[PDB]
Amino acid sequence: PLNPKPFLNGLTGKPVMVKLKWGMEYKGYLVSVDGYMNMQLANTEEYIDGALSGHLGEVLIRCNNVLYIRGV
Amino acid sequence: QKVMVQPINLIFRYLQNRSRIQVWLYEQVNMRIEGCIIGFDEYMNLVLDDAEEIHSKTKSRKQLGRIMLKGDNITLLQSVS
Amino acid sequence: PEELQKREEEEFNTGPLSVLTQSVKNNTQVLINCRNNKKLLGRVKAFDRHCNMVLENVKEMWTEVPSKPVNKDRYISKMFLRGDSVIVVLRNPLI
Amino acid sequence: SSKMLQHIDYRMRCILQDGRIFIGTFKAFDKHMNLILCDCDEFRKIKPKNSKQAEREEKRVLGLVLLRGENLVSMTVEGPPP
Amino acid sequence: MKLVRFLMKLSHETVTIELKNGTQVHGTITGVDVSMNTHLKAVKMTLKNREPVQLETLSIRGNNIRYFILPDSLPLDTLL
Amino acid sequence: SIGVPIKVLHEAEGHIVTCETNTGEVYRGKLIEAEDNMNCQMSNITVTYRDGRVAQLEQVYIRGSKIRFLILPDMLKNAPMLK
Amino acid sequence: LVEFTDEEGYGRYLDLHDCYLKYINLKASEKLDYITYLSIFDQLFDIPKERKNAEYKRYLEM
Amino acid sequence: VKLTAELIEQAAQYTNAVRDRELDLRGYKIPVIENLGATLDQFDAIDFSDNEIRKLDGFPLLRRLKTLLVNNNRICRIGEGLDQALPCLTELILTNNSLVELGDLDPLASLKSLTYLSILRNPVTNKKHYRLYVIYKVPQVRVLDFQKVKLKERQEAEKMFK
Amino acid sequence: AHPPELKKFMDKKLSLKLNGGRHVQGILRGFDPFMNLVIDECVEMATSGQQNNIGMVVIRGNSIIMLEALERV
RNA sequence: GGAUUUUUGGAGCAGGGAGAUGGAAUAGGAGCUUGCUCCGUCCACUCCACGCAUCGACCUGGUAUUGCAGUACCUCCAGGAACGGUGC
């Protein structure tokens, strides 16, 4: 058992591919995602269907888009 | 009369088994999440392990590892292993 | 109230919304990413927990297919945004 | 404030979750503001799927409808109070 | 604090609301409560691929709104 | 607090009503058990699923979260909520 | 009835706010303020404060 | 006697018999067809039970109209601009009226939406080939004298009077 | 803060419509005040007539906007 | 009092292919207006795979019922698809 808090905390900073509800897969090191599940990564690149395409980096997503989050 | 078997009881027994199941999604019944859950909380925001997206029409599987899918985009699961 | 707003500043500043916190303490023009694919670029003047942000020098662009979609572009300087239509709030775009 | 509390009891076009307009003689509000529209009807776009066929709306009436809170996109007045 | 209270600084205020069903409207709303509830007035509204439809007393919802535009003579720091 | 909407739902439960849901799932029948969270139990209903084969089932559990609307008793137009 | 707006006064004020908003949404200038608006809307045929070789001319026509 | 928007706003605009928006003005003998559009796009039926309207004319732009009662009236002729002001119109019930000759059927055909009609109790009734003239001029009609139209009637009505 | 009224329907058969147009045919087995009706002997029904027995579905009311009855209970 | 039932949203989007088939008067570009060639938005006809099935209302003729009760909607056969959304 590795709950949301410990798992998303050991992956908060681990470069995560995070799939949003429209194909957006962020590739980058999360800053913090607290109980509000508000995501925010540092030096994360955009992906559509897993294709790295964008350079905005430290971007802060609302959890309402989040489909999945994994530490690559 | 009869007592309640919580969905959290289901998820807890599944996690204790460390079992592999495929899970349903929202507004797209084509794709299924094939993987195992590692832990849980009081919120039922499903955390997963060695998961992969499996498409019905396309017939592909894209793996994530220890992924953290959304909690509201869960519907149910079938324990495949 | 008092200690709650103290923890609230600490939450907006040292949490996930650090992008908008720096847009507010640094006066940055930040990319609020809609869940509906309408890209608005501009500052952040009022910002809080739920990602409710008021943006100055706001410029909204869309992929408008009349064909090959064009960038429908307009710039309303001051304009507010609630955090429901927002998917993200990113501190720094390359433009 | 309770803004609509003045404009209720008249035939009001309430807007939908999917873009219809439904003129019901609106009654009351809530914290979720779920509508209780009396003498209430609906009408939505009869999409031609084409342009040499034109767009209309077929008439539907529920009478008194308890529109769940997730409905309203707007509430305007389309009929004075009878 | 929230910017819901910043939008609470709007009465006799010339605003423009782009709502949830592809809507974009010019409006002097009637009165707005804490949950963003801002009822329009004398408003020219156009949803996705629409006309300038007029509402003299209309009630624009909350979470079914997307973007708000305030007056030009509106001091931001004084409004939040 | 308590909703005269919920009072309307309580006056609409028990008999023939006609709920209309999100994707077009509209069930016209005895909306037996509705709880103020609107998870409406209908009984002996004819539901369309927007499919135009609006077929009759029994004791359906049509949630109210998807409920676009609900046609209620046309006899309680003089409700105690509005009066 | 419909020939008099709120502040217009039936012949006291006029509607320059709408064309001003259109020009704002067109030019998008961080200093397109009262002085520039009034100077563009007072004169007749100066060298205009926006390109008339774009849709700014049509917007002025509206 | 002045028929005003007093009697059109005070008119009853609510559920008809077939569950549509009807606006009754019974008991006025109103001979003045004016001030009506103040039904405000929430009406489909305009009823003038007990009226003395010198003929059929005097309505506003109603793209929605779905029933109109011009019975127990003083209808002598039939005015021209009826369709563009009633495109949704199928029910223009003008029985107990005083239409006389088939020249009062000149604007009757220009509508594309007429199916449920009544001109009963008119001297245009017992005249020979009167229903023939009707079944010629009214293509999309379905309800004529409260019994269906016929393809045999349409054959007769097109073929005759070449 | 009120549990739902699936009380005489428990341990009985329902055919449910959840999001994705899907159906879960099963027994009412377990729930919470969150209405998360959990179906054992529950089988999926897709867009096509294909159906797979899922073992024990804990189907959240997050999506399932319908479910009909197989008996009177 | 922004987490599985209503108000901090899963919303956005795009209409299947083609024939020396065609309309843009006042509206598209280049070949520097007219003529003519090719080119990135629809509909009418026709070929497929009338985009595919269900059902509902209706138009057609035949056909069973003379009957009192508060309606989701009440005949049966057969054609056609003028109209609606449901699975791809």
PDB file of all heavy atoms in Angstrom, chain H residues 47-76, unseen atoms left out:
ATOM      1  N   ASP H  47     -57.411  33.956 -30.705  1.00  0.00           N
ATOM      2  CA  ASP H  47     -58.830  33.638 -30.759  1.00  0.00           C
ATOM      3  C   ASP H  47     -59.658  34.894 -30.526  1.00  0.00           C
ATOM      4  O   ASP H  47     -59.428  35.627 -29.559  1.00  0.00           O
ATOM      5  CB  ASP H  47     -59.175  32.577 -29.711  1.00  0.00           C
ATOM      6  N   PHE H  48     -60.657  35.105 -31.379  1.00  0.00           N
ATOM      7  CA  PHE H  48     -61.526  36.271 -31.288  1.00  0.00           C
ATOM      8  C   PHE H  48     -62.979  35.817 -31.288  1.00  0.00           C
ATOM      9  O   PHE H  48     -63.803  36.301 -32.064  1.00  0.00           O
ATOM     10  CB  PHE H  48     -61.258  37.260 -32.421  1.00  0.00           C
ATOM     11  N   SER H  49     -63.290  34.837 -30.440  1.00  0.00           N
ATOM     12  CA  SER H  49     -64.668  34.407 -30.258  1.00  0.00           C
ATOM     13  C   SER H  49     -65.553  35.604 -29.929  1.00  0.00           C
ATOM     14  O   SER H  49     -65.189  36.469 -29.130  1.00  0.00           O
ATOM     15  CB  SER H  49     -64.762  33.363 -29.147  1.00  0.00           C
ATOM     16  N   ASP H  50     -66.729  35.648 -30.563  1.00  0.00           N
ATOM     17  CA  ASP H  50     -67.630  36.798 -30.478  1.00  0.00           C
ATOM     18  C   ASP H  50     -66.952  38.069 -31.001  1.00  0.00           C
ATOM     19  O   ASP H  50     -66.605  38.978 -30.246  1.00  0.00           O
ATOM     20  CB  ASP H  50     -68.147  36.994 -29.050  1.00  0.00           C
ATOM     21  N   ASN H  51     -66.710  38.083 -32.312  1.00  0.00           N
ATOM     22  CA  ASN H  51     -66.128  39.222 -33.007  1.00  0.00           C
ATOM     23  C   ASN H  51     -66.961  39.577 -34.234  1.00  0.00           C
ATOM     24  O   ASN H  51     -67.731  38.760 -34.741  1.00  0.00           O
ATOM     25  CB  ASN H  51     -64.685  38.931 -33.433  1.00  0.00           C
ATOM     26  N   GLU H  52     -66.817  40.825 -34.690  1.00  0.00           N
ATOM     27  CA  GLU H  52     -67.468  41.312 -35.903  1.00  0.00           C
ATOM     28  C   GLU H  52     -66.478  41.861 -36.931  1.00  0.00           C
ATOM     29  O   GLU H  52     -66.740  42.905 -37.544  1.00  0.00           O
ATOM     30  CB  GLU H  52     -68.511  42.373 -35.549  1.00  0.00           C
ATOM     31  N   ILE H  53     -65.353  41.180 -37.138  1.00  0.00           N
ATOM     32  CA  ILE H  53     -64.267  41.668 -37.983  1.00  0.00           C
ATOM     33  C   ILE H  53     -64.705  41.706 -39.439  1.00  0.00           C
ATOM     34  O   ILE H  53     -64.994  40.662 -40.035  1.00  0.00           O
ATOM     35  CB  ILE H  53     -63.009  40.798 -37.813  1.00  0.00           C
ATOM     36  N   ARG H  54     -64.746  42.911 -40.022  1.00  0.00           N
ATOM     37  CA  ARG H  54     -65.312  43.149 -41.351  1.00  0.00           C
ATOM     38  C   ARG H  54     -64.818  42.174 -42.414  1.00  0.00           C
ATOM     39  O   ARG H  54     -65.539  41.938 -43.389  1.00  0.00           O
ATOM     40  CB  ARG H  54     -65.013  44.584 -41.796  1.00  0.00           C
ATOM     41  N   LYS H  55     -63.624  41.609 -42.259  1.00  0.00           N
ATOM     42  CA  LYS H  55     -63.158  40.536 -43.124  1.00  0.00           C
ATOM     43  C   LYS H  55     -61.978  39.862 -42.445  1.00  0.00           C
ATOM     44  O   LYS H  55     -61.693  40.102 -41.269  1.00  0.00           O
ATOM     45  CB  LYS H  55     -62.785  41.047 -44.520  1.00  0.00           C
ATOM     46  N   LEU H  56     -61.289  39.012 -43.197  1.00  0.00           N
ATOM     47  CA  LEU H  56     -60.067  38.354 -42.741  1.00  0.00           C
ATOM     48  C   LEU H  56     -58.885  39.244 -43.132  1.00  0.00           C
ATOM     49  O   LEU H  56     -58.471  39.281 -44.292  1.00  0.00           O
ATOM     50  CB  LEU H  56     -59.942  36.951 -43.334  1.00  0.00           C
ATOM     51  N   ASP H  57     -58.359  39.970 -42.146  1.00  0.00           N
ATOM     52  CA  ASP H  57     -57.168  40.795 -42.304  1.00  0.00           C
ATOM     53  C   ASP H  57     -56.789  41.353 -40.938  1.00  0.00           C
ATOM     54  O   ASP H  57     -57.549  41.254 -39.972  1.00  0.00           O
ATOM     55  CB  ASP H  57     -57.396  41.922 -43.316  1.00  0.00           C
ATOM     56  N   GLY H  58     -55.595  41.941 -40.868  1.00  0.00           N
ATOM     57  CA  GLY H  58     -55.194  42.706 -39.700  1.00  0.00           C
ATOM     58  C   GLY H  58     -54.354  42.001 -38.648  1.00  0.00           C
ATOM     59  O   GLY H  58     -54.456  42.318 -37.458  1.00  0.00           O
ATOM     60  N   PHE H  59     -53.508  41.062 -39.062  1.00  0.00           N
ATOM     61  CA  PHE H  59     -52.687  40.372 -38.083  1.00  0.00           C
ATOM     62  C   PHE H  59     -51.234  40.843 -38.162  1.00  0.00           C
ATOM     63  O   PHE H  59     -50.818  41.395 -39.188  1.00  0.00           O
ATOM     64  CB  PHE H  59     -52.751  38.855 -38.301  1.00  0.00           C
ATOM     65  N   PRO H  60     -50.451  40.671 -37.096  1.00  0.00           N
ATOM     66  CA  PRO H  60     -49.035  41.040 -37.141  1.00  0.00           C
ATOM     67  C   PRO H  60     -48.161  39.860 -37.540  1.00  0.00           C
ATOM     68  O   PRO H  60     -48.626  38.741 -37.760  1.00  0.00           O
ATOM     69  CB  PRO H  60     -48.753  41.482 -35.705  1.00  0.00           C
ATOM     70  CG  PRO H  60     -49.764  40.719 -34.868  1.00  0.00           C
ATOM     71  CD  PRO H  60     -50.772  40.071 -35.790  1.00  0.00           C
ATOM     72  N   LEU H  61     -46.862  40.134 -37.612  1.00  0.00           N
ATOM     73  CA  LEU H  61     -45.870  39.125 -37.985  1.00  0.00           C
ATOM     74  C   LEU H  61     -45.772  38.093 -36.868  1.00  0.00           C
ATOM     75  O   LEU H  61     -45.194  38.348 -35.809  1.00  0.00           O
ATOM     76  CB  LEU H  61     -44.523  39.784 -38.254  1.00  0.00           C
ATOM     77  N   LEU H  62     -46.361  36.921 -37.104  1.00  0.00           N
ATOM     78  CA  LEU H  62     -46.305  35.788 -36.187  1.00  0.00           C
ATOM     79  C   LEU H  62     -45.759  34.577 -36.931  1.00  0.00           C
ATOM     80  O   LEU H  62     -46.519  33.831 -37.555  1.00  0.00           O
ATOM     81  CB  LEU H  62     -47.687  35.475 -35.602  1.00  0.00           C
ATOM     82  N   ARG H  63     -44.444  34.377 -36.848  1.00  0.00           N
ATOM     83  CA  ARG H  63     -43.813  33.219 -37.463  1.00  0.00           C
ATOM     84  C   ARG H  63     -44.101  31.934 -36.696  1.00  0.00           C
ATOM     85  O   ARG H  63     -43.682  30.852 -37.120  1.00  0.00           O
ATOM     86  CB  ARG H  63     -42.302  33.436 -37.577  1.00  0.00           C
ATOM     87  N   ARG H  64     -44.821  32.030 -35.577  1.00  0.00           N
ATOM     88  CA  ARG H  64     -45.058  30.888 -34.711  1.00  0.00           C
ATOM     89  C   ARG H  64     -46.493  30.380 -34.738  1.00  0.00           C
ATOM     90  O   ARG H  64     -46.722  29.229 -34.351  1.00  0.00           O
ATOM     91  CB  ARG H  64     -44.670  31.234 -33.268  1.00  0.00           C
ATOM     92  N   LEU H  65     -47.445  31.181 -35.222  1.00  0.00           N
ATOM     93  CA  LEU H  65     -48.869  30.923 -35.039  1.00  0.00           C
ATOM     94  C   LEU H  65     -49.234  29.479 -35.368  1.00  0.00           C
ATOM     95  O   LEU H  65     -48.832  28.925 -36.391  1.00  0.00           O
ATOM     96  CB  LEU H  65     -49.695  31.863 -35.917  1.00  0.00           C
ATOM     97  N   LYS H  66     -50.025  28.872 -34.481  1.00  0.00           N
ATOM     98  CA  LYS H  66     -50.407  27.470 -34.600  1.00  0.00           C
ATOM     99  C   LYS H  66     -51.906  27.238 -34.536  1.00  0.00           C
ATOM    100  O   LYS H  66     -52.361  26.152 -34.902  1.00  0.00           O
ATOM    101  CB  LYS H  66     -49.730  26.630 -33.506  1.00  0.00           C
ATOM    102  N   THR H  67     -52.677  28.215 -34.064  1.00  0.00           N
ATOM    103  CA  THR H  67     -54.126  28.189 -34.172  1.00  0.00           C
ATOM    104  C   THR H  67     -54.650  29.618 -34.128  1.00  0.00           C
ATOM    105  O   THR H  67     -54.054  30.497 -33.499  1.00  0.00           O
ATOM    106  CB  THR H  67     -54.775  27.349 -33.068  1.00  0.00           C
ATOM    107  N   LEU H  68     -55.752  29.850 -34.829  1.00  0.00           N
ATOM    108  CA  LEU H  68     -56.445  31.130 -34.805  1.00  0.00           C
ATOM    109  C   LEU H  68     -57.931  30.857 -34.934  1.00  0.00           C
ATOM    110  O   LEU H  68     -58.347  30.067 -35.789  1.00  0.00           O
ATOM    111  CB  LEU H  68     -55.967  32.055 -35.925  1.00  0.00           C
ATOM    112  N   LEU H  69     -58.720  31.492 -34.075  1.00  0.00           N
ATOM    113  CA  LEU H  69     -60.175  31.383 -34.096  1.00  0.00           C
ATOM    114  C   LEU H  69     -60.737  32.687 -34.648  1.00  0.00           C
ATOM    115  O   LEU H  69     -60.690  33.724 -33.974  1.00  0.00           O
ATOM    116  CB  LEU H  69     -60.727  31.087 -32.703  1.00  0.00           C
ATOM    117  N   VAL H  70     -61.246  32.635 -35.881  1.00  0.00           N
ATOM    118  CA  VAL H  70     -61.930  33.766 -36.493  1.00  0.00           C
ATOM    119  C   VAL H  70     -63.351  33.328 -36.820  1.00  0.00           C
ATOM    120  O   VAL H  70     -63.954  33.796 -37.792  1.00  0.00           O
ATOM    121  CB  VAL H  70     -61.194  34.264 -37.751  1.00  0.00           C
ATOM    122  N   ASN H  71     -63.874  32.396 -36.028  1.00  0.00           N
ATOM    123  CA  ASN H  71     -65.259  31.977 -36.160  1.00  0.00           C
ATOM    124  C   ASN H  71     -66.165  32.906 -35.358  1.00  0.00           C
ATOM    125  O   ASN H  71     -65.706  33.676 -34.505  1.00  0.00           O
ATOM    126  CB  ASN H  71     -65.430  30.530 -35.690  1.00  0.00           C
ATOM    127  N   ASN H  72     -67.465  32.820 -35.638  1.00  0.00           N
ATOM    128  CA  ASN H  72     -68.467  33.732 -35.089  1.00  0.00           C
ATOM    129  C   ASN H  72     -68.063  35.183 -35.348  1.00  0.00           C
ATOM    130  O   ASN H  72     -68.190  36.063 -34.494  1.00  0.00           O
ATOM    131  CB  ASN H  72     -68.691  33.472 -33.597  1.00  0.00           C
ATOM    132  N   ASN H  73     -67.570  35.414 -36.566  1.00  0.00           N
ATOM    133  CA  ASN H  73     -67.044  36.701 -36.995  1.00  0.00           C
ATOM    134  C   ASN H  73     -67.806  37.176 -38.226  1.00  0.00           C
ATOM    135  O   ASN H  73     -68.741  36.523 -38.702  1.00  0.00           O
ATOM    136  CB  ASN H  73     -65.541  36.623 -37.294  1.00  0.00           C
ATOM    137  N   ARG H  74     -67.387  38.329 -38.742  1.00  0.00           N
ATOM    138  CA  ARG H  74     -68.015  38.940 -39.904  1.00  0.00           C
ATOM    139  C   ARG H  74     -67.089  38.848 -41.108  1.00  0.00           C
ATOM    140  O   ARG H  74     -66.980  39.795 -41.891  1.00  0.00           O
ATOM    141  CB  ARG H  74     -68.373  40.399 -39.611  1.00  0.00           C
ATOM    142  N   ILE H  75     -66.409  37.711 -41.253  1.00  0.00           N
ATOM    143  CA  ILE H  75     -65.494  37.487 -42.367  1.00  0.00           C
ATOM    144  C   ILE H  75     -66.277  37.450 -43.670  1.00  0.00           C
ATOM    145  O   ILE H  75     -67.128  36.577 -43.874  1.00  0.00           O
ATOM    146  CB  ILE H  75     -64.687  36.192 -42.177  1.00  0.00           C
ATOM    147  N   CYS H  76     -66.001  38.402 -44.556  1.00  0.00           N
ATOM    148  CA  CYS H  76     -66.582  38.413 -45.891  1.00  0.00           C
ATOM    149  C   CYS H  76     -65.585  38.000 -46.969  1.00  0.00           C
ATOM    150  O   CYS H  76     -65.937  37.231 -47.869  1.00  0.00           O
ATOM    151  CB  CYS H  76     -67.142  39.804 -46.204  1.00  0.00           C
TER     152      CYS H  76
END
